[model samples]
Target: SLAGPTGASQIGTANGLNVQIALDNLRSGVNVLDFMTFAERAAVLNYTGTNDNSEAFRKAFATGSRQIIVPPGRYHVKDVEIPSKVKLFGTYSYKPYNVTSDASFGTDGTIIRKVAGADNMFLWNTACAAEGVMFDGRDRTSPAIQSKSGGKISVGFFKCGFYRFDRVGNRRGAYIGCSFQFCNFNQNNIGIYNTVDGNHIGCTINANKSHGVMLETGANSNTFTNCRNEWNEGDNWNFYGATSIQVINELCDRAFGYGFRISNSSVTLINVNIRRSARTAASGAASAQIYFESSTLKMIGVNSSVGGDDTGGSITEPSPDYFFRMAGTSEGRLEISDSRLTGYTVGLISGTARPSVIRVINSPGWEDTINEGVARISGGRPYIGTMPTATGPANVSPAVLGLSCGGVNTYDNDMFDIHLTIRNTNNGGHNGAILTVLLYREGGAARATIVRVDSRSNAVGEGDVNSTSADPQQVYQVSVEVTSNDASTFNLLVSTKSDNSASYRFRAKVKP
Candidate 1:
């Protein structure tokens, strides 16, 4: 089917009078059908699991366009509906579009998973914006989906090879990968009282399944490098917060905003081996294996551990901060060198990762790295403002918190001593007005947390932790910020009662 330029029949222009079309008489060998929805034809393709060649892309979608030679064998392209500009290659010579296979997809077997049912939802996208797509599940058989519902977009899977899979319930928004295998890492729950906000998968997810990689996502500003996540024995449970993977952000209908979450937005997890993982029941495994909530997450090289080996019971999420859960402010960043974190779900929560306003930088190899542990750095100046922009419908403004005392500092007395506590209690009756306590720090240059008060909460200037933002009714203020050195700061606690009564807190710390 080759041989098109019969001596230049108006082909391509700016020329040297041409007619070149040789290469074994031109059966054209490289178009792999999917030219943004077929400039001509190429559609009816299916390669379910294992690995398949599909008659060399049905003979390169039969030429109308050309190039579809898929080498390997076994396949399981299930319920199929590829549509979008697709390309699944890999037969060496760099033609990488492999949908991987050792041959496994299902009868309840072969790793074929939930096959798009449950009202069907299996979407692999790239309407028109795509670059070389690949899915090589290597020696396939697990996962592939026991249930994947779809409804939150941002898909990108490179290398794609998932091992031993099993998932089950109320899962939404969808974004996968980050430590999977042995079977069961976020196992769908169906009805534990099912709720709404389940998945946005905001991005920064690099989960692995035991050893070899592929599958796990959430948070998408991409920059994962050195990606590796290890976890074996499993059972799927999402303890509501501490993320092994949790990304959410959907709120624009009543807009008070506090949705867009991330379980542990990683920065870099080199080498990686989360040893076992925090399961909920079975001989007791509830200390916290891999937890991350928020504080502008950034974890460079991580290794986690807690209790293990128990097919019995013990692990419910009681809250010792629950092994590693953070709060708001979210300027998140942590770079623990070399890495090794054993039995810690409680040992460094408001310290090291979140609470000083999210910027836990500690990597000069941090004291030679791990078990022997000891590394730290320090910087300065901070006092911020800005980031509160809204208009229409009973509006109000306040977000740019503070930082521009030049980044790092100290005034201990426990700084403002935490428990960002806000106790207006209003009961005795007093909405008379005047009360102010605003503090925000990520680093000067206008990062604000509104402060303009004068009515007795008294705190005028260690640079304004609110000496008086003006109040005569509600009273209860406590603001904190500490770390003159081993920094990673965050601090915010604002209060007002104009509509109902306000209290917003985000505290952090690291300097030990």
Candidate 2:
């Protein structure tokens, strides 16, 4: 009904009514159909696979409207540049795309289907936002959405879906900030490849071929809250030299590689549940549920389980290897508190490289095989290695035992309550020796205090009550000594006067 130009007096007439209505609509926002040609509007309105409407979008954007509305239909657009401070609002239902059913077809929303091969479907300018839209890449080997580099832009996407991209679903360049709420990035080579800050809330990143969320170098201070990354071919959340990331209330399920792989980064995880890693043979080094290489990790209330799915036919369910594997030669620190890590052959495996410090507090089911490090365990019984057997008066020399249960490194101010049990195969009787020692550094010298010692011999029905005795009839001798000059290490010396077939077992509980 929009016709030719009119005279001056025709402004207030009925023919001018359409102009007034269009002016009123322009006050709020502009519709994309207003700038489209007849054929382009018809193709977009009728959902026909006909015309490329990228030029119409450019015309609409040139109007400098604060908001642009796209109606609930299919529009083919490629290489569109959205300007800054402009919001593209779509007339679609605000819901997540059903990955199971919506993979083959588009959803019942405003869909922007890419028409041809392009580096990015939409190049986002600074401070642009999108809501309630679905972007279908049509299997293009490029990112569905990207933000321009060297900009102080912070884009926001709410209740949106980015799908079917062969490369990356969303890519954020360096120094750019992005916030995603209730969004999904699925069926892409990589769900998201981030280089800077990102804040994600209630998002689901699933079924990606490479990785669910990858933080490359220079990515820092990113946060994920109540998010899930599941069924990904690579690591669920991978950090390659990124730093200062935090993940809270996260679930990583059925990852083909590690649930979380961190290399040369620092991360904090709280209330995270990771399960069933290495579901395929393409898993990365060591095949651990969580792998850390020269990274600082702080985990609280975390539970990680490594196993295989039996429902996957012809898939081998190997024994769970390691819950956490530490590699690389650089020194790092790992702290786990109030966590239950289970269902693994070894709880923690430390590689033969530069030593790191591991502290486990009130966390059970974590027995470690540390090659070189200071592993301080509190509120649990530490696993001790097998000690050689001693015999006769010639075996009266004290055997020095390392302070750490699994490694050789020790720290100052470490207090231990050690329980020693010696068994004699000659008479099939057992002797119990208990001692508590405090090792500390004082005035640049190593010093140890034998706080308490008790011994009981069942063979002779005799025991030493508050005595540090070396009598042959007392069954066993226990003592503590400082092994280092700076008081950084100590040794537990034990000697048995039993026969040559006497073997000993000991367990220590470290106290902070």
Candidate 3:
């Protein structure tokens, strides 16, 4: 009975010893209730593989500081709902005494696998962190980890992995909306789909049956930094429908489907490499390495290696329909700069979706810093078309393609041949066309056509002017001699004044 200020017993007697003992118990000391203080006091369950640790785990969550230090020994947990404000730290040892701080989740065999009647291994919410652990989905019926009720919650994962986690069966063919992980519907789907701001650092999502990482349905501003997505059936980084997503320093390897399929969002990909896209599908079936349906996609410093190397083997895989395809009803904005494409027939494809603006800058494999404004019907497809709006001498009506120059240098004033090719589009029912090349330096121009040589002789003049044959289908191989006397980066303005608006291809080979 502890009492008033000066050791007076509240029981009204001089019980000094009882008062002193009670006061000492309330003083600063070790809490015997702490889980770290006792070996057996906090209910460290004994080793028995068949024991149901789900109840024991629940008790620890409710009884302790919302934290349960998992001693490593293959924890068989089922449907464990990790409440908010709880952080799990796994001990890398079977024995409880051999625990180290930051020893990674499951470092010493702390595998949180599914047991009978268990669903997802962990259901996380706002302000939670999972690190240094491996989630074994075992190809179960549910996802290995998912958000607990969708909202604008910030979640994070570091140094973790997902394996064998999946949903979707064989009968649900092409369930594009459903995603499966460790692995989507009859096809099966497995992976991570966050609904809000999430960050994945140094994680690996492999062998997933569906999209490796998806930011869809209210999931905005998610970042995947230094992550690896491999062996996924669907797109490696998919924005099924979301807003403001980014992928930086991501390595996507061997996706059986499209590497990236984005729509309805602002997505930016930086320092991302996509290799071996759609390795399983037949030719003309798998879309492109990167397919954009409708979105604002800005790709800077990106590289794509689709369909592997095309070696001359027996029955090798054909290249995809195109390296990149864009099509959707609404206007889609596509800006790609400093990128490379390998193993495909056409470099870029615009699939019949008009008003889709494509601005490509400084990229090889196709144009070099050319804005092919608007998609036009050429050869039955919506290929990029350059608007004939240039008024200067440097601007030709129909842009030239495949230009090569040869044999014009300082050492030789003697005439050297300049070879070129031009398309035969018979404008205004006339099969004739005129080819011209002018070497201009310091704002002065010089016509280079001293003489013309046509493998098929033209129907008209020589010296500087030549006419095409009446056959509209003929691709003329035209040549002219250029004097190498005065040359300091000659501004060669090459064009064709044809019967109709015709397309020309400029060719040249340099020889001193």
lDDT of 1: 0.30
Off by over 4 Å in 2: 5-27, 94-103, 148-152, 166-175, 282-286, 305-321, 345-355, 367-379, 382-512
For candidate 3, the lDDT comes to 0.50
**TM-score computed on alpha carbons, candidate 2:** 0.71
Q: After superposition, how far is residue 78 of candidate 2 from its true place, in Å?
A: 3.1
**CA lDDT of each prediction against the hidden true structure:** 0.30, 0.67, 0.50
- For residue 210, what is the lDDT in candidate 3? 64
Which pairs of residues clash in candidate 2, taking residues 3 or more apart in a chain or in different chains? none
Q: How many residue pairs clash in each candidate?
A: 128, 0, 31
Backbone steric clashes in candidate 2, count: 0
lDDT of model 3 at residue 347?
47
Candidate of highest lDDT: 2
RMSD per model, one decimal? 21.1, 7.4, 12.6
Task: Name model 1 segments beyond 4 Å from true.
Answer: 1-54, 62-84, 87-104, 107-208, 211-246, 249-321, 325-354, 358-512
* TM-score of candidate 3 on Cα atoms, chains taken together: 0.57
**Candidate 3 residue lDDT tens string, 1-512:** 24456654343325545555666556342222232323332333332343334554565666645545554444456666677766665533322221123232333444555666566666665555554444554444656445556433444443344445563111111112211211111122645655355554555565566676665645566666776776676777788667787788876776766777787877888878877676655545355777777778877877866554346533345435566666668587777688775546554664666335556665667563423433333222332222122222212242323322332343333343333333333332222334444433333333354344443346323422223443443333333333343442233334444443443333332221
Estimate, for each residue in 1-512, the C-alpha lDDT of model 1 and write its tens digit: 24554534444434443333333345334644332232122222333323322333344444433223333322234423233344344331122111124333222211222222223212333321112222222222223322233533223322223332322111333443222111211111110111122231221212223212111343233222222222222222222322232212211110001111234444333433444444432212233333445423444444444443334444423222223445555555544543444434445343243533333333332232221122223343222222122211211333222221223333311121111222233333322213233334344321223233333344212232223564434333323332333233334334333454443332212222
User: Which should have the higher TM-score, number 1 or number 2?
Assistant: 2
Model 3 alpha-carbon miss at residue 318, Å: 6.0
User: Residue 383 in candidate 2 has what lDDT?
Assistant: 35
